[PDB]
Symmetry: D2
Subunit: 453 residues, 4 copies
């Protein structure tokens, strides 16, 4: 075979056949044996966190090395700790009085689609949950992130083998193509797809004929209520928003601010490193946010100074993020969409009801089912505001990046955030190890069936 | 007539838009208002169980009215009782230690695909679980069951309306066509597909671009170990196998019997109404079990006497099931496949190990992930036999029809039995109300994110 | 509004069924009855040519009324004269020495796809050749020209009918949709597709499952050799290029001019109304020629003054066309593409070999198999230049608009110009009446077949 | 084996790229150089006719070696003779009074789809007409005839190359797959599809995005009018019908016979080797004509004795064809469909009018646009009968096999019989060399364009 599309198809087929053999071997191991493999994988991810981070920044041009290192550690530490004690081998629950017990059943071979924004960390995370549940996994990288994705996969497989795992358990397409992605998603041997990517790739996953856990995009609106701790709220928002220069789907995109505290919030934002664009600077930044009707890849995950330069504006070197005041919401209004960069929209609101109506509109521009935030000290207000928001993660008094993924609030640590039915997803959960094994129920007859009505 | 396809598309579009408006109204109600609607629906199903049963037998030619009535009552009583106390409105859980509230979120509009074998009971089952989780539902019948399916939906909607539900909540396609099925599965307003049907239609649901809960087919092997109470085992098996003349996917298809108790088992089966075919009779029956290389629809749900007539053999009028001693397994051995009728294969085995190898082979002929059975009093044998069977329902000392669906063993009452990844499904659960709402998590800041490494 | 797609499908189905019935009636008529019908149609077109021209300019904003009026007359007169004496009924050829005779066989129902640039004239031309060949025809308009296209079809039907034609012989989709176009191209009653449109629609026609005659796009290069009558060649070029403000695919897009007459040709161009853009103005005009990577629709068929304003430059009010001197060819050099407007590129060449090289490059930019031109009085040069050019119409000493369609050179009058295999078409012919009937051959035994080798 | 699909796709891409290069070199040759290449090809086909015939019978199980040898010679002789003097290089026509020239332009690369019934003869025919028009051609065989089809191709290429043709001009997919068929039909470099096969491949060819010449199936009804020379009609009918055991699409499938001569026709048929089935025998043969609502592949191109064994009937050795009297027409009546084997239907009619009505109904069962036949000496009846038949080939006083392909009546020699719009084809012509080059017209200004 000479041509790269055919070669990539053959490569996927080889990987899946090898994965099938590897998973048969893995399924026979004890819980201790599995847990030892997962622990070794987590240890290698930890050791390799910085180096993988630097590969990703260099290859993709997104983000910064210190934050990608922390993203990798989040996968190596937080994800690992949330699954290390989960029972995944044999009988995992007995219910003596109902005369049922539950047996864990691996799904088999998982197809992992990896994003360009979180390439190495998503590999670490998916490799850990897949292998803990006793599956093999075959990865498909984004073409912009092919080399670092593959290196992360190799490190996981080699760490797994050192602890006794079989060859071919963890693999990665080396030459990404549409043909190979299509083969991986539709192949006979593929059992479950974990599709972490854009809406089109997720749509393909749910068109594949295979069971799939997809995600949806975010466009996270955050309400700062007049009861907020303003300095703390601003601190949390800025740390979350500028993390890896805004590459995570759960990051803040718009602030909705009660008019009674707007002056204080602005001053606090400015003090903590935000640059407020004037009407002319806003137009110039706006004109590079979108090209040809969608987000400009060239601003994704870029420092505020790089964005400033691209837009032809002039800012201080210590600026942490750009902010623009906004009144409108929609695709024709670039500051109201998901920006995946250190840029925030700033909407003034009269109170909670106007905030909710704006939040609903912003979610409808490419954020349904994903994440919202609120900063407030009034529980009544928090309860009334949050109850009807279409998001699987409703983050209170925390940065939405770190809350969404379960770093700083107690949802399951994950880099695959299901957006529920409203987001065209099978679940609203943070996807984790329990999504990658089936439960079999052994159940005894305890009632008699009548055969007369 | 030329344009029934276009009219059926239009009808789907009308139902979904009416379903959209209805669900919005439903979603605003209290738990008690929802529960009153569900209760009224259950009551009406109970009252109409016999009339729906009769419509289904006459229209499809499958089964008998007594058993179909019981099947409807299973949906009206067992399913109702298993969901009536489930919380589905608002905050369903507050986790004070983890600082997380769980909010129940309806998926929206469910597309319910209905099989020709369990037409009215599946409608009852799906309508109850859909409405209890605060959804609208649009049904799609098999063409050979369009009238009884639509009548069951009509009765569910009228019952719901009587107790306060909005018009348009529950609807059913009246003119089934490929175009309409396609429209329903792919339409922008459809949120989740419940696909109960053949592997073809389920594959279509997982190809639709939408989240789906599919099923897989059964081909249930049942092991009678030498330790079994033989009279009781045979009774449970015959009651289950002949229920509705064998139309339920969980019903027994092959018995695997320890040689040491073969003669007793055969004699007990004969005593309880089984007719063992001789070699000439076997071959005549085998000829009408499949046409092309697939199950012959004309024997599905037929009394033994009808089948005898079809195969041109004669049998006593009191015969309850046909049995055929067999040694081979494969698509080309018609007695080893799923027969969906009162025909049972009979395999002799030396012990448990040989039983497992045959069970495994039978499941591979179109039963993976579905159901298995075993009859035994030796607990260690039970434990050893059951641990490695690829079936979501592993039924011990009960009829597999009634065990699988949760009538006589404690799995969730359901007529949509997921077969997990091994059967191309997103779950191995008995599908129930918890599969039709997403959980949103309101989660408070409880940890700090480290700024550096 | 929601169901306009479904209504348009039903509309197509009605038209096709009525056309089938109409065509059956028409096929039984004599040659003289057919010719009377065709004559009536042509007279009606001749009478309506001005009115339909004004409708098309009004609805599409392309071109001008005087030139569209002449375009309609081309179809009502030239096309009509080229077919009125063609034999299309019964035996059309007798070969007595070969013992064979030919019988004309109508193709049946023709699907005619109509462009936005030539909406009324293409309808006239197609209706004439279809009915002359004893076919029915169902038209599909471009959306931006639906009204004037439908009105042209109506006038043709009513004229046919006045002369004795059946109802439903000529029809037109009134609400164009993708669904209707698809239905028309693929319907079981559709016999032959005339696809006059962009490469996307023609590709759809060759993917329809049906026999199709398509076109390709033009990008016509014209060589002015030093032997040319310069005043006459510039006059021919200008009249052709500015006709309907350059909407026709066969219109000149680039001039290739011998260095030795460069100054004379430039001067002659200016004298006859050409405005040569300077570097400043070039860049401004280029900015509006392409939006995204394709031709800007807003310049199509616009007077040079409109284009000047759009580009924000000032030109004298008597300017008939803009000209830009160029050296590069390719899809990123906007002056080298097909411009469908009164803009002309202008290349200097040392002589014939460099002219050929450039013409080949220019046709590769979206003109393959369509049209080329040369002005020259040297016969040897004409022969050597034309022999190897990939164009079905090779126009000598004439404007290419009028030449390509057969107004001023002797190719068959047509508005559907096949670009041959090189342009992804079944023919390189100017499509006309002989493409719309099949020939049947009645042939007698004249030789004996050997029985043995 | 797992990835033969991928290998076959790569093979197609290699052939197309080499085809491209080859055609570019071929296009520069003189008419004289082209004609020498074509002649050399036709010579080699002639020499290899018997050998190819034996391979095809062995590989496919269809027909017999003698008739297949004749079929290959028809391509090597009749097709060659019909194209060898056609002008195809450069300027092919000049017109001083209209001031127009015509230049022949090769289509480029031809994808030739080859049926299982005529596998080697169709390769010879398509290669000759494609290379004569100065094209390259890539063949796609039916899986049942892969080896003999590739060998026919190899022989043409070798012969062409001996006479100076470039490498890669003529090629053939060696392992047929769906993937490879799809690739060849849809590839960027493919210019024209010649689709000779069942309605399904033909549909795929007109669904490919590419210009295509398809065929349609035959179901040829033949009318024997009371004015016919009966002994001669029967002979022509039997020789045509039994040729290669009935594998050619133009072959007779049903006789429509004037009541007034019925007895003589029956007697004459029997005398010339026909076996008339009794009612019981008819039911048994009917039972194996159709399998699963379509023509049973297992009777295609089989001797009548072989068909007799399959049906459980007993017939003499010297029988040449089976005949059944029939009254009904439709898919539910196996004797009324296209049988591609030495089986004929026998209908009695009162006269021409019932014959036409019957002929129309038989064509609507899978024969539209293809071929029809009549045997008669009354010129007026011939004219009256033929004028309204929807067939591109209307064969008079000849066997329809040999008439339809142009062996024994003057239509262009061809094994790709277009069935017109009524047969879902772009033409009703016997496809030949002129369908494989475009005409470019060099045309001079002769008129002025006005205003108002
Ligand atoms: Mg699998
Ligand atoms: Mg929705
Ligand atoms: Mg037709
Ligand atoms: Mg080409």
């Amino acid at each position: 075979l000479r041509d790269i599309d055919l070669q990539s198809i053959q490569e996927v087929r080889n990987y899946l056949e090898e994965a099938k053999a590897a998973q048969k071997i893995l399924e026979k191991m004890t819980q201790s044996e599995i847990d030892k493999i997962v622990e070794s994988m987590a240890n290698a991810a930890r050791e390799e966190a910085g180096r993988l981070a630097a590969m990703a920044v260099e290859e993709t041009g997104f983000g910064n090395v210190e934050d990608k290192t922390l993203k990798n550690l989040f996968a190596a530490n937080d994800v690992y700790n949330s699954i290390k004690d989960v029972k995944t081998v044999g009988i995992i629950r007995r219910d003596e009085e109902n005369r049922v017990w539950e047996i864990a059943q691996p799904v088999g071979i998982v197809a992992g689609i990896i994003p360009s924004t979180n390439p190495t960390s998503t590999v670490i995370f998916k490799a850990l949950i897949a292998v803990k549940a006793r599956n093999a996994i075959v990865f498909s990288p984004h073409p912009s992130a092919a080399k670092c994705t593959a290196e992360a996969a190799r490190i996981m497989q080699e760490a797994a083998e050192r602890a006794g795992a079989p060859k071919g358990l963890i693999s990665c397409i080396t030459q990404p193509t549409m043909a190979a992605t299509n083969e991986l998603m539709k192949h006979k041997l593929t059992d479950v797809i974990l599709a972490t990517g854009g809406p089109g790739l997720v749509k393909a996953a749910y068109s594949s004929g295979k069971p799939a856990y997809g995600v949806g995009p975010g466009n996270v609106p955050v309400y700062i209520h007049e009861s907020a701790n303003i300095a703390k709220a601003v601190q949390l928002i800025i740390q979350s928003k500028t993390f890896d220069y805004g590459t995570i789907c759960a990051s803040e995109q718009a602030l909705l601010v009660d008019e009674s505290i707007k002056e204080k919030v602005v001053a606090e934002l400015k003090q903590q490193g935000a640059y407020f664009l004037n009407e002319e600077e806003k137009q110039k930044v706006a004109s590079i946010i979108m090209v040809n009707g969608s987000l400009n890849a060239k601003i994704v995950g870029k420092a505020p100074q790089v964005i400033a330069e691209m837009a032809g504006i002039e800012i201080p070197s210590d600026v942490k993020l750009l902010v623009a005041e906004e009144t409108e919401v929609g695709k024709e209004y670039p500051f109201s969409i998901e920006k995946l960069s250190p840029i925030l929209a700033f909407y003034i609101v009269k109170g909670m009801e106007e905030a909710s109506e704006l939040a609903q509109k912003l979610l409808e521009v490419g954020g349904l089912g994903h994440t919202v935030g609120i900063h407030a000290e009034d529980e009544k207000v928090i309860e009334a505001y949050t109850i009807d928001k279409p998001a699987g993660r409703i983050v209170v008094n925390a940065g939405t990046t770190f809350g969404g993924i379960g770093a700083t609030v107690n949802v399951k640590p994950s880099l695959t955030l299901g957006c529920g039915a409203i987001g065209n997803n099978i679940t609203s959960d943070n996807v984790t190890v329990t999504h990658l094994f089936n439960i079999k129920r052994v159940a005894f007859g305890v009632r008699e069936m009548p055969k007369k009505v």
